[PDB]
Write a protein that binds this ligand. Structure first.
Ligand SMILES: [Mg+2]
Ligand SMILES: [Zn+2]
Ligand SMILES: [Zn+2]
Lengths: 147, 56, 49, 391, 32, 45, 140, 69, 115, 262, 184
RNA sequence: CUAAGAGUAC
């Protein structure tokens, strides 16, 4: 999950050669769906991605405090000075064919947390197993091979 | 309510779900470990003697 | 970096959650519902420390 | 599992990873996401149970729901957005990509359709390739607002014999809506053909969107300078009207609407003015957004988002309300200790004039937090009560 | 800066906050 | 750990304790509370 | 094979609309005073401006020989001869409506993969058009 | 914990530039951006690899060894 | 737990071959070739080199599922032209072009002095 | 005759060149092969004899696997899977040993220069950890407080980046074509003016800008790709490119051989 | 902060001035010889005050000093703020960002988000995996989870350097693309 | 094993 309530599980993993790449050879660590943005209105996610890109380029640290006078306009100007599109878009190329993607991709660093919920601690199946002594029904819980 | 209208059952699995645009509408992807755990009893018939013997 | 503020009971770290309550020695007046014969009630939960 | 569609029979496909995998279209009846949701699987243990599971609870047999006599599954999320982008008049596809997309359809009969443009360069249109997925013999005709037999706006929909004659394919056509393509196909050719149609449309549109790309960024929430100035002017005019109504009420010249008190009428007028102000500013911002705007594209396709989302992200978040009223005087006659007593101005009682792009002032941030808290509390109470009522 | 009695700026208040967190800490209420 | 060490619980009248009150400004976090049954009852300093 | 229709039109308007590669043009026949045309054209692939004279033809096939799509399209081999060799902009579409505008005027609607065309004129020369597939050939 | 051997995104070896980076920050009084540029980190993937690292191993080294030889 | 071994991406398993050809019944003179332990890197190249051929009516490929490293390639040629022959010609052309490119790059590199 | 190459810059670790008269598919396949398919040497197995450090055993094993190793003569090494030895031998592996002790009162840094090759390289040019910085110390494997010890033995096999990214010798590969967007393969997102808002690429100087009046060229294809290949250090960058081309050619040749044999 | 008449400037002003800030800075730098100046010194000299909800009913608070104390062409990108048109303040907020708690202080740009998203992140950051203590190697806890390479955020708040988040981070800076790449 | 409690996921 990001720091804006944008939780999600890994759908699939692609190796580097299959990921989309920019003209500089940079490939994303993560790809998230655009459709997560409009309904949830997590603008701070986008602003933080832009600020992180600027900070990584310039070597400073982005001041993402809430009620400061930091605007997307200034971050965009700083990003433009560094030689990138001011709004964070980058011309990417499809990994499979190497062709330019007709649409430009929002691209940049973002801080993500690994949450404690892993699938290997949740997967559980039971054909037959221990039965409860009273009701002669399957026991409860995956720690007990329950049903 | 707790043991007659609804009760814990065997031959059931549970886990996290993921999307797959490459699966049909009526298809479900099943982990190999779960498929190896859950079982179905097939009666031995002249029509399925060979494959059941192979599975055994 | 450990900040303390917890106890060690039988080797387990135990923290006391701050319990919220209504303050004492304060007069509070409340309107009652229509069916009840009393319309307003002014009460104090008197206590001495 | 609130309804019978939340429990359906699927066909096993053994896969080498530790999660259940399911089609994107079937997530709507299950009300399932992929943000940590878990699902349960039951294996029938006899030929009778197996057979009735396959013949009564199968997913294709559930496509049209008895709940509202309309399909419950449709095209959603990326594919939906993709299909809207694929069926535009501008979209043209070259020979190699056409061959790929045709081969991606499992039941394609093996004949390459004649390109829509033959000279000077063989080009296929998006509608032409998409019509390969639609089964042969399907007819559909929907007339949107203002569409004629010629479509200047390319809206509406005309499909003849399984070929899209005109209209941009979007939610009204391939969504879970009555009279749409899903409904027509399932009622004409049967559930199996409708499931196959789901698969074909998903495959082709997903391939095209893979090799076309779609994104969204911060720049998609930005309106140009003149539009921002007009939005500010609209907000200022609304605040002036609120101030005028406040002056009339303070002068006691305001007359109470029949059936309500003076204060109730004043609150109604103020809330109406602020709501229509937010609506007008959002409409200005939406009009300003270009057809290349990605949030606009997602709204137009209907895959995600709405006009209010655009208005709140770009123009104005709007009036925050708790229990259907403006923010109450939690302190003695004032909402916060940063305001004077008896301040009924829009900013005092929870009007957020800033958009999410601009950011919220501390007071607006707190008032928005109060609104969100009310939403969460309502969610919890609602789920408990509705569960009991449903039982 | 040079003037000792000059009014502070919004940037200066963080110094004050730092002093607070130097004397109090995060769990001051429990220990107190 | 830091959040746990600054947690307040309200045992559960005709009031509406789950709402974020105006008086909560600057004393408890405007947005930090469980989504479950404890929403609003469990607060953080 | 044979041209079901042919004429020369003058373009009075070109409307880009919301598109970047496609424009809708209204044209009036230079000979007949009652034949008019509305057509969507891939202007990127074939630029068109106002007051441009376009020779417009509708045919049932492109092969020079007479008629003896249901057959899979194939790339044009080197040395293939077709009617399209005589024109600059060729589309393939289907008729989907035959409207009776008036007692004498009829209109025929064609769709080339979503590019719409409406040809209106007296029925005495539009009679050859029927509900089928047709090639639209244009030369400047 | 300790500086990663390679950049996560592109795979450039950055595990041999931590000491040089600290030396540049301390001895030469360069700001972070110029030091990163001097070390040869031009893509911002590598720049975030080295710029955001937190060297926790130092703290781990303060505790006395459990098995001391 | 359920993750497959990474060497299954490029190592042929027991009892399977690199190529298998199945005649296609949808259209005449067409085949579908399944390539095992391969991915886009080979498929896109082969398909494009096939599309450069003048006697190839149809050429396409698809990777049906990312989980498995295999892809299907449909080839249809004009009458009297074996699709296997088309595949052979495409492969030979690719090898010739790569050899020429290797020679050119070696010659260009040898011309350098600052390396 | 064939694809033409003209290289702008050459270095020890970067080569910037232009690849003209070639298809887009061929350039992309070459890029993918360079990323993923080139064999390389890296530490695969770790036997830990003593670890009193503050880092976990598999933590250090992971770090060691990521150490770049000389792979110039990797073609003379065999894969462990198709070698007739039992676990590992001299024909398919290189054995290194790390032995560090904290004898100093200050922190002692365990670098990759401390790795010692124990197996007989038989005259090959593989195994040596790659040293790039001026100080001569390689990657910073670990740190030792006084009294702490770390003794371990690594076995390094040859592998490709597909099996694990630690075998990738390619780092980042810049790849661009058609800087002026004359092929119209992208639709530039913009607010007021696309040309002003999109900074020009450095390769725009190598092509003629569009005339702003000419009609769209619908027959032009994509060629003249500007590619910049970086090297991790395992093999020289020119060898990276040459071996990528060789690997792609070998793949196609294997396809031909299988087709002929069946 | 306490606000008084300050007749010298003729208008309300904070009791705290640059000299006290300088002394606090000097003490902090010495900790990282002058007379120690701590928070208790600010408290004793009547510079800051403790206010509870009951006393907060009878005061007026300025949100920020620089914009609300002094008596009254603007950047269109900045958010709209109101001067309140009132000069009778009794106190000033030390910093508005201090209304947030420990978990909410980690959110970057929390004022550019929908409030339920902030609540979700506040709940979900406690489940973030990082380094809970530096002595995890000598504690026999029932369960412990540690990142190999914790990274401090590229976008960071001022309040999170009192929470030691940069010293004990619970996440990583991943290169993220927002794209409909494969439908997965 | 049983019971009670707490935290948590959707
Ligand atoms: Mg969910
Ligand atoms: Zn990097
Ligand atoms: Zn061996």
């Amino acid at each position: 999950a990001s720091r804006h309530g944008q939780k999600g599980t890994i759908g699939i993993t692609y190796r580097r050669e299959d990921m989309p790449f920019t003209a500089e050879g940079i490939v994303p660590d993560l790809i998230i769906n655009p459709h997560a943005i409009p309904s949830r209105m997590t603008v701070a996610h986008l602003i933080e991605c832009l600020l992180s890109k600027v900070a990584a380029l310039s070597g400073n640290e982005g001041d993402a405090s809430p009620f400061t006078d930091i605007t997307v306009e200034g971050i965009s100007k700083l990003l433009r000075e560094h030689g990138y599109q001011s709004r964070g878009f980058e011309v990417m190329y499809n990994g499979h064919t190497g062709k330019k993607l007709m649409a430009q991709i929002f691209f940049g660093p973002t801080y993500y947390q690994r949450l404690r919920h892993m699938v290997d601690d949740k997967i559980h199946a039971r054909a037959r197993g221990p039965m409860q002594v009273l009701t002669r029904q399957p026991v409860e819980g995956r720690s007990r091979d329950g049903g | 309510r707790g043991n007659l209208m609804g009760k814990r059952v065997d031959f059931s699995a549970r886990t996290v779900i993921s999307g797959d645009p490459n699966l049909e509408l009526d298809q479900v992807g099943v982990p190999k470990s779960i498929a190896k755990t859950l079982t179905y009893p097939e009666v031995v018939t002249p029509y399925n003697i060979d494959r059941l013997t192979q599975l055994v | 970096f450990d900040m303390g503020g917890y106890f060690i009971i039988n080797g387990s770290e135990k923290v006391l959650i701050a319990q919220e309550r209504s303050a004492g020695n304060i007069v509070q007046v409340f309107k009652k519902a229509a069916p009840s014969p009393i319309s307003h009630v002014a009460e104090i939960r008197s206590a001495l420390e | 599992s609130l309804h019978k569609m939340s429990m359906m029979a699927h066909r096993v496909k053994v896969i080498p990873y530790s999660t259940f995998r399911l089609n994107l279209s079937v997530t709507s009846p299950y009300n399932a996401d992929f943000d940590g949701d878990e699902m349960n699987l039951h294996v029938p243990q006899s030929e009778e149970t197996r057979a009735e599971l396959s013949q009564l609870c199968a997913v294709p047999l559930q496509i049209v729901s008895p709940q509202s006599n309309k399909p419950c599954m449709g095209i959603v999320q990326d594919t939906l957005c993709g299909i809207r982008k694929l069926t535009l008049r501008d979209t043209f596809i070259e020979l190699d990509q056409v061959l790929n997309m045709l081969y991606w359809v499992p039941d394609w009969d093996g004949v390459i359709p004649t390109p829509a443009i033959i000279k000077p360069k063989p080009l296929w249109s998006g509608k032409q390739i998409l019509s390969v997925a639609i089964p042969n013999g399907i007819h559909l005709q929907r007339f949107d607002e203002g569409t004629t037999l010629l479509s200047p706006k390319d809206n509406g929909m005309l499909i003849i014999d399984g070929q899209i004659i005109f209209g941009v394919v979007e939610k009204k056509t391939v969504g879970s809506s009555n009279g749409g393509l899903i409904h027509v196909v399932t009622r004409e050719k049967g559930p199996q053909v409708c499931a196959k149609l789901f698969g074909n449309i998903q495959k082709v549109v997903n391939f095209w969107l893979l090799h076309n790309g779609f994104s969204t960024g911060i720049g998609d929430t930005i309106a140009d300078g003149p539009t921002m100035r007009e939005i500010t002017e609209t907000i200022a005019e609304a605040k002036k009207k609120v101030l005028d109504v406040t002056k009339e009420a303070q002068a006691n010249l305001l007359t109470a609407k029949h059936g309500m008190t003076l204060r109730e009428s004043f609150e109604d007028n103020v809330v109406r003015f602020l709501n229509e102000a937010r609506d007008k500013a959002g409409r200005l911002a939406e009009v300003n957004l270009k057809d290349l705007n990605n949030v606009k594209q997602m709204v137009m396709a209907g895959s995600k988002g709405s006009f209010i989302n655009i208005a709140q992200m770009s123009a104005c978040v709007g009036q925050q309300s708790v229990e259907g009223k403006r923010i109450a005087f939690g302190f003695v006659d004032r909402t916060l200790p940063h305001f004077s007593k008896d301040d009924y101005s829009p900013e005092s009682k929870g009007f957020v004039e800033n958009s999410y792009l601009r950011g919220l002032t501390p007071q607006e941030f707190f008032f928005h937090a109060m609104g969100g808290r009310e939403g969460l509390i309502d969610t919890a109470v609602k789920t408990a009560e509705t569960g009991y009522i449903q039982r | 800066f040079e003037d000792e009695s000059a009014p502070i700026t919004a940037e200066d208040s963080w110094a004050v906050i730092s002093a607070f967190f130097r004397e109090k800490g995060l769990v001051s209420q429990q220990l107190d | 750990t830091l959040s746990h060490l600054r947690r307040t619980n309200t045992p559960i009248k005709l009031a509406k304790p789950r709402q974020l009150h105006n008086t909560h400004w600057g004393l408890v976090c405007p947005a930090e509370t469980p989504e479950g049954q404890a929403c609003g009852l469990v607060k953080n300093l | 094979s044979n041209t079901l229709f042919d004429d020369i039109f003058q373009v009075s308007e070109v409307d880009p609309g919301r598109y970047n590669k496609v424009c809708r043009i209204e044209a009036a026949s230079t000979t007949q005073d009652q034949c008019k045309l509305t057509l969507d054209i891939n202007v990127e692939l074939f630029p068109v401006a106002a007051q441009d004279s376009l020779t417009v033809t509708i045919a049932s096939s492109l092969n020079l020989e007479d008629t003896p799509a249901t057959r899979s399209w194939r790339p044009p081999q080197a040395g293939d001869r077709s009617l399209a060799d005589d024109y600059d902009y060729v589309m393939y579409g289907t008729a989907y409506k035959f409207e009776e505008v008036s007692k004498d005027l009829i209109a025929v609607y064609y769709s080339f993969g979503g590019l719409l065309m409406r040809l209106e004129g007296n029925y005495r020369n539009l009679n050859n058009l029927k509900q089928e597939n047709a090639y639209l050939l244009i030369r400047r | 914990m300790i500086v990663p051997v390679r950049c996560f995104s592109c795979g450039k070896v950055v595990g041999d530039k931590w000491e040089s980076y600290l030396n540049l920050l301390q001895e030469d009084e360069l700001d972070e951006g110029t030091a990163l540029s001097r070390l040869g980190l031009k893509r911002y993937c590598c720049r975030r690899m080295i710029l955001t690292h937190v060297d926790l191993i130092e703290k781990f080294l303060r505790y006395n060894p459990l098995e001391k030889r | 737990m359920n993750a497959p071994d990474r060497f299954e991406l490029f190592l042929l398993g027991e009892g399977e071959s690199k190529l298998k050809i199945d005649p296609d019944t949808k259209a005449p003179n067409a085949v579908v070739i399944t390539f095992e332990k391969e991915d886009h890197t080979l498929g896109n190249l082969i398909r494009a080199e096939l599309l450069n051929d003048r006697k190839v009516l149809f050429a396409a490929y698809k990777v049906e599922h990312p989980f498995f490293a295999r892809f299907k390639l449909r080839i249809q040629t004009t009458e009297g032209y074996d699709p296997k022959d088309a595949l052979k010609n495409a492969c030979n052309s690719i090898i010739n072009k790569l050899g020429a490119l290797k020679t050119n790059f070696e010659t260009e590199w040898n011309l350098q002095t600052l390396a | 005759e064939g694809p033409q190459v003209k290289i702008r810059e050459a270095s020890k670790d970067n080569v910037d060149f232009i690849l003209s008269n070639v298809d887009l598919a061929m350039a992309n396949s070459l890029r993918r092969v360079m990323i993923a398919e080139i064999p390389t040497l890296a530490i695969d197995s770790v036997e830990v004899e003593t670890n009193t450090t503050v880092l976990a055993d598999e933590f250090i094993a992971h770090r060691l696997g990521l150490i770049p190793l000389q792979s110039m003569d990797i073609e003379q090494l065999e894969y462990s899977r198709d070698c007739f030895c039992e676990d590992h031998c001299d024909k398919c592996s290189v054995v290194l040993t790390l032995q560090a002790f904290g004898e100093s009162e200050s922190t002692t840094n365990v670098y990759s220069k401390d790795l010692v090759i124990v197996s007989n390289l038989m005259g090959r040019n593989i195994g040596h950890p790659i040293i790039q910085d001026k100080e001569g110390n390689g990657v910073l494997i670990c740190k030792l407080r006084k009294g702490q010890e770390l003794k371990l033995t690594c076995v390094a096999k040859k592998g490709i980046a597909k099996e694990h990214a630690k075998w990738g010798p390619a780092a980042a590969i810049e790849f661009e074509y058609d800087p002026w967007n004359k092929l119209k393969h992208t639709d530039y997102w913009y607010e007021q003016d696309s040309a002003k808002e999109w900074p020009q690429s450095k390769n725009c100087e190598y092509e003629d800008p569009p005339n702003e009046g000419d009609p769209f060229d619908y027959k032009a294809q994509a060629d003249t790709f500007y590619m910049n290949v970086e090297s991790v250090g395992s093999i020289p960058v020119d060898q990276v490119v040459v071996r990528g081309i060789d690997t792609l050619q070998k793949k196609v040749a294997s396809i031909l051989l299988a087709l002929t044999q069946m | 902060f306490i606000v008084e008449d300050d007749e010298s400037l003729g208008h309300k002003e904070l009791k705290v001035r640059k000299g006290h800030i300088a002394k606090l800075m000097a003490t902090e730098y010495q900790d990282i010889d002058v007379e120690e100046y701590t928070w208790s010194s600010l408290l004793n000299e009547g510079l800051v005050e403790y206010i509870d909800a009951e006393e907060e009913e009878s005061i007026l608070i300025a949100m920020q000093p620089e914009d609300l104390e002094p008596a009254e062409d603007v950047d269109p990108a900045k958010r709209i703020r109101v001067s309140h048109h009132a000069t009778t303040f009794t106190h000033c907020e030390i910093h508005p960002s201090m209304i947030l708690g420990v978990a909410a202080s980690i959110i970057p740009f929390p004022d550019h988000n929908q409030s339920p998203r902030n609540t979700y992140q506040s709940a979900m950051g406690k489940q973030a995996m990082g380094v809970f203590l530096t002595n995890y190697n000598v504690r026999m806890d029932t369960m412990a989870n540690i990142l190999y390479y914790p990274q401090k955020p590229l976008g960071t708040t001022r309040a999170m350097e009192y929470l030691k988040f940069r010293e004990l981070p619970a996440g990583q800076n991943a290169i993220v693309a927002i794209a409909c790449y494969s439908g997965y």
